[PDB]
Amino acid sequence: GSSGSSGTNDEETIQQQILALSADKRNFLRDPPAGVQFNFDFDQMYPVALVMLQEDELLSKMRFALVPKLVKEEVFWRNYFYRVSLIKQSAQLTSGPSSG
Incomplete structure (x- = not known):
């Protein structure tokens, strides 16, 4: 059983x-x-962060x-998020061709 091709975007x-x-x-x-x-909204990303904690003990x-x-x-x-958003966004930002 080999594995080389993935397909799905670089989300893993x-x-x-x-x-x-x-x-x-x-x-x-x-x-x-x-x-x-x-424009980061704490109260907004306040609770959403709780889910990232339980999953990540280190965090x-x-x-x-x-x-x-x-x-x-x-x-x-x-x-924390600031850096995160950059990571996730990149996935797309780095679509391929660079212009401008």
Whole structure:
């Protein structure tokens, strides 16, 4: 039984990347600049993050010891996602041909 072809977009990895973040603390502290228009709504992505915790013990066990240890539960959920959205978006952004 061999396996070479996949087909489905690069979504199987998107999750693998979002995991590497949990194993990092510099990300929780690091925050995006102003120029970048990242309209993030905590209260909105507040609960949705709870589901990512249970699944990812590292993301929880850490956040707890890294918050407010590091940043406010809110901010933490802000910087964290920020990087995430970039990973997921890429999947598409990198459609193929580059123009402009």
